[PDB]
Amino acid sequence: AEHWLLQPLPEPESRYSFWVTIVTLLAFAARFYKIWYPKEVVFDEVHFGKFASYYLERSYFFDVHPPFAKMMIAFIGWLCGYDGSFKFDEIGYSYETHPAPYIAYRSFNAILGTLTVPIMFNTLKELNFRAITCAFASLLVAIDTAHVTETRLILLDAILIISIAATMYCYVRFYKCQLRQPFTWSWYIWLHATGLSLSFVISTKYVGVMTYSAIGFAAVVNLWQLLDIKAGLSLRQFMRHFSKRLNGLVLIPFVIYLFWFWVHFTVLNTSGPGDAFMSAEFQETLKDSPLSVDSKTVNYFDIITIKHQDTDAFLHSHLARYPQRYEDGRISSAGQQVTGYTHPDFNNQWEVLPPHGSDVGKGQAVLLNQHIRLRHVATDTYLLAHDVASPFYPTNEEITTVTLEEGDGELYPETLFAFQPLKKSDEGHVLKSKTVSFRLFHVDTSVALWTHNDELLPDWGFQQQEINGNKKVIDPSNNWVVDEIVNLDEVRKVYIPKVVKPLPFLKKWIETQKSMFEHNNKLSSEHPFASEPYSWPGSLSGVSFWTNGDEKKQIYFIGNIIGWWFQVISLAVFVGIIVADLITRHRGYYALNKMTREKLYGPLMFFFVSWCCHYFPFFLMARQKFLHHYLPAHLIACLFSGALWEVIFSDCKSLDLEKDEDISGASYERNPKVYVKPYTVFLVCVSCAVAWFFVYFSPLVYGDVSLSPSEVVSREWFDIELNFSK
């Protein structure tokens, strides 16, 4: 496409500036519309918000994707002065109870999604297409429902898609500089800008290898043309092209990719949820967490305080006794009261004793799920649970205490407790203060100790929380932690500051990289929205991102079906045109003008092959896949479709059907007329249909409007299952 791409622009710059401004303002309006809504965690915000928090805390985490895009999200949190306190644990968590800077994160993605549109516009402008063609192709991304939904939420895809758009643009700029004058300062700038953008693509997600393949193919095709003796280059000049492109497109981008891992390991210098994925040698490079520095192994004969996780109350006892009858007339034991108390005192102190007749001595660690006894230090009594109903809950057991003589006698079984782990995998691990949650499980009656703060004991229980034996052992509200060890040896009191051992960066990176590829290939899950590659170009199914049951509102991830089908038709029509051109030429019939062919076999073939690189490799992947994996291919299909329809509405005819205009010295029409009037009417009709669809699906893009069940069902077609259709 040398003669086509070296032409002046087909229109004045003011027309391009007008249309790029309009489509950028539409893209801005579509992404920033109600950006504060929903005020809850949506979809994969549970992952990328959580990773932003771990960067701010400097806590080591593992993920299957490279660090760059997550560090960009974390960097916005850092600019907002966010500390990482909020964890984004589940979908539907309110941003009002724990203020994460979610508007700033969503706004950052909305900016990147908006800036993608003028990069797409300028890509076609640089390929010498008309301003209306550039506007239309960019509009197909500006008001696509899937591109809008993804680029307003705290997702990696806004950073991926802008980096792909920037890669395509920078490569087109590089290629025009290559056609005009190679080895100019501008040629080096655009080569290294293509490499930089390619680095950001692969540093966001490994699917970025498809963008390397697309640009790599185009760069190899152009290197082949420069290797031809007809190019007039010496082998030394060719080798200069090769070595400079290898440096700009492979070596420098690889150094920038490694730089993001170097930043990642320098920021994440504290032990965290990622430790389980790494070797002990890697974990030795991490500092102890600030929380772990105040943690200690619990031993037999340690005096401990036991704290409830949900109510912050301590397990407490005092010389007061349960009333012989509760207010409902049930009979209590008239035993010593065990209560939940929110203030630290001497009545919160329990000594951990081993079972009677055990060989277990002072300084041995308590293991999870081992039988223990708890002695209340202030009253010198054993903790006890029995078949007596609790004050407020007739089905739950009263928790009391017994004398040492009675508890070493007949009531011995009723004094047996265990620090039962929350997970069966954790049985037999060493109990530690502050870090190990457990259920305080009674061995004989099979209940867990529980407390609540919705109702307080009457005046006879000092308005303290009730402690009772809950029969629903698995209930997450039965969770306790050892808060303090009161009798900690001064040496034990002295924190043991792990000596951080250094690991060479390349060893650290190779280990993390192997773990990334192994976990990415080795993973199960399910996700009731996974989609095979054959369904993507049709947008035949989508993904539920968020639902509110009370308001009957939902966010649903789906493509603009009119826009996507228009692109499928465009791809099919182009294959038909190329096959027809090849057949007719093989018959000595030259239907198409040289300039039409330069558009078809240059920019359109470049986008078609680039789309193939972002679509067909997914048929070879056996892992879970989803519709969002097609957004890179759809982005290229928007450029392609805009370009194709300008060619179809151009004067494509050869001057002489019996003569090949590609023969050196043949006359050909250099400025094929575009039929602007019917072309503009056609583009307006398609744009109005795409805009109508975007408005019709806007309640599902924004989640901001409740739909009646009949309106929900009216948007269910193919394999689109929506919530609230009943």
Ligand X SMILES: CCCCC/C=C\C/C=C\CCCCCCCC(=O)O[C@H](COC(=O)CCCCCCCCCCCCCCC)COP(=O)([O-])OCC[N+](C)(C)C
Interface ranges with ligand X (CB under 6 A): 521, 532, 534, 616, 619-620, 622
Q: Is 320 in the site for a copy of itself (CB under 8 A)?
A: no
Single-letter amino acid, residue 592: L
Q: Which does 358 bind (CB under 5 to 8 A by kind): ligand X, a copy of itself, none?
A: none
Residue owning tokens 């826009």:
563
Task: From residue 481, give the alpha-carbon distance in Å to each of 144, 419, 550, 577.
Answer: 50, 9, 35, 71
> Quick one: 423 or 587, whose CB is closer to a copy of itself?
587
> Quick one: 499 or 620, whose CB is closer to ligand X?
620
Q: Is 499 in the site for a copy of itself (CB under 8 A)?
A: no
586, 673, 677, 726: which one binds a copy of itself (CB under 8 A): 586
Q: Is 236 in the site for a copy of itself (CB under 8 A)?
A: no
Nearest of 634, 674, 667, 624 to residue 650 by alpha carbon: 674
Residue owning tokens 């330069």:
598
Nearest of 285, 284, 252, 280 to residue 266 by alpha carbon: 285
Backbone angles phi, psi at 423, to 5 degrees: -115, 135
Q: Is-contact 260 68, C-beta < 8 A?
A: yes
**Least spacing, CB of residue 609 vs ligand X, in Å:** 12
Backbone angles phi, psi at 385, to 5 degrees: -125, 145
**Least spacing, CB of residue 560 vs ligand X, in Å:** 21
Query: What is the total count of residues that contact a copy of itself (CB under 8 A)?
Result: 9
DSSP assignment of 708-721:
-HHHHHTT--TT--
Enumerate long-range contacts of 342-346, CB under 8 Å, 24 or more apart: 342/311, 342/312, 342/313, 342/314, 342/465, 343/314, 344/305, 344/314, 344/484, 345/314, 345/316, 346/377, 346/378
Q: Is-contact 127 643, C-beta < 8 A?
A: yes
> Quick one: 263 or 612, whose CB is closer to a copy of itself?
612
**Least spacing, CB of residue 106 vs ligand X, in Å:** 35
Q: Is-contact 508 265, C-beta < 8 A?
A: yes
Q: Which does 616 bind (CB under 5 to 8 A by kind): ligand X, a copy of itself, none?
A: ligand X
Nearest of 120, 46, 125, 132 to residue 86 by alpha carbon: 46
> Quick one: 17 or 521, whose CB is closer to ligand X?
521
**Least spacing, CB of residue 609 vs a copy of itself, in Å:** 20
The whole-angstrom separation of Cα 159 and Cα 75 is: 13
8, 81, 185, 229: which one binds a copy of itself (CB under 8 A): 229
Q: Which does 345 bind (CB under 5 to 8 A by kind): a copy of itself, ligand X, none?
A: none
Q: Which does 586 bind (CB under 5 to 8 A by kind): a copy of itself, ligand X, none?
A: a copy of itself
Interface region with a copy of itself, contact rule CB under 8 A, candidates 127-135, 495-503, 586-594, 707-715: 586-594
The whole-angstrom separation of Cα 320 and Cα 460 is: 8
Q: Is 494 in the site for a copy of itself (CB under 8 A)?
A: no
> Quick one: 549 or 576, whose CB is closer to ligand X?
576
25, 221, 227, 510: which one binds a copy of itself (CB under 8 A): 227
What character string, x for contact with a copy of itself (CB under 8 A) and - otherwise, covers 539-578? ----------------------------------------
The whole-angstrom separation of Cα 427 and Cα 450 is: 21
Q: Which does 228 bind (CB under 5 to 8 A by kind): ligand X, a copy of itself, none?
A: a copy of itself
> Quick one: 336 or 531, whose CB is closer to ligand X?
531
> Quick one: 291 or 583, whose CB is closer to a copy of itself?
583
Q: What's 443's DSSP letter? A: T
| Alpha-helix runs per DSSP H in 587-702 | 594-599, 605-615, 631-648, 676-702
> Quick one: 320 or 657, whose CB is closer to a copy of itself?
657
The whole-angstrom separation of Cα 171 and Cα 213 is: 13
Q: Which does 312 bind (CB under 5 to 8 A by kind): a copy of itself, ligand X, none?
A: none
**Least spacing, CB of residue 261 vs a copy of itself, in Å:** 29
> Quick one: 6 or 575, whose CB is closer to ligand X?
575
Task: From residue 620, give the alpha-carbon distance in Å to each of 193, 513, 531, 617, 623.
Answer: 31, 22, 14, 5, 9
Nearest of 69, 39, 40, 35 to residue 55 by alpha carbon: 69
**Least spacing, CB of residue 538 vs ligand X, in Å:** 10
Q: Is-contact 551 704, C-beta < 8 A?
A: no
The whole-angstrom separation of Cα 428 and Cα 406 is: 30
Q: Is-contact 637 643, C-beta < 8 A?
A: no
Buried b (16+ CB within 10 A) or exposed e, 21-53: eebbebbbebbbeeeeebebbbbbbbbbbbbbb
Structure tokens at 565: 């089908």
Q: Which does 229 bind (CB under 5 to 8 A by kind): ligand X, a copy of itself, none?
A: a copy of itself
**Least spacing, CB of residue 307 vs a copy of itself, in Å:** 39
| Alpha-helix runs per DSSP H in 440-556 | 490-493, 505-521
Q: Which does 36 bind (CB under 5 to 8 A by kind): ligand X, a copy of itself, none?
A: none
**Least spacing, CB of residue 522 vs ligand X, in Å:** 9
Q: Which does 246 bind (CB under 5 to 8 A by kind): ligand X, a copy of itself, none?
A: none
Of residues 612 through 651, those in contact with a copy of itself by CB under 8 A are: 619-620, 622
Interface region with a copy of itself, contact rule CB under 8 A, candidates 65-73, 251-259, 452-460, 584-592: 584-592
What character string, x for contact with a copy of itself (CB under 8 A) and - otherwise, covers 12-51? ----------------------------------------
Q: Is 588 in the site for a copy of itself (CB under 8 A)?
A: yes
Interface region with a copy of itself, contact rule CB under 8 A, candidates 153-161, 180-188, 227-235, 435-443: 227-235
**Least spacing, CB of residue 629 vs ligand X, in Å:** 14
Q: What angle do CA 725, 106, 133 make, to 5 degrees?
A: 85
Classify residue 411 as left (phi > 0), alpha (psi -120 to 50) or beta. alpha
Q: Which does 227 bind (CB under 5 to 8 A by kind): ligand X, a copy of itself, none?
A: a copy of itself
Single-letter amino acid, residue 705: V
**Least spacing, CB of residue 490 vs ligand X, in Å:** 53
Q: Is 587 in the site for a copy of itself (CB under 8 A)?
A: yes
2, 228, 327, 387: which one binds a copy of itself (CB under 8 A): 228
Half-sphere exposure of residue 167, counting CA atoms within 13 Å on the CB side?
Answer: 33
> Quick one: 227 or 523, whose CB is closer to ligand X?
523
Q: Is 6 in the site for a copy of itself (CB under 8 A)?
A: no
Q: Which does 532 bind (CB under 5 to 8 A by kind): ligand X, a copy of itself, none?
A: ligand X
**Least spacing, CB of residue 203 vs ligand X, in Å:** 22
Interface region with a copy of itself, contact rule CB under 8 A, candidates 89-97, 226-234, 441-449, 642-650: 226-234
The whole-angstrom separation of Cα 162 and Cα 112 is: 6
Backbone angles phi, psi at 287, to 5 degrees: -65, 155
> Quick one: 474 or 622, whose CB is closer to a copy of itself?
622
Peptide bond into 38 cis (omega under 30): yes
Q: Which does 588 bind (CB under 5 to 8 A by kind): ligand X, a copy of itself, none?
A: a copy of itself
Three-class DSSP category at 337: strand
> Quick one: 83 or 662, whose CB is closer to a copy of itself?
662
The whole-angstrom separation of Cα 568 and Cα 37 is: 33
**Least spacing, CB of residue 587 vs a copy of itself, in Å:** 6
> Quick one: 262 or 619, whose CB is closer to a copy of itself?
619
Q: Is 523 in the site for a copy of itself (CB under 8 A)?
A: no
Task: Summarize as ranges the residues that interact with a copy of itself (CB under 8 A).
Answer: 227-229, 586-588, 619-620, 622
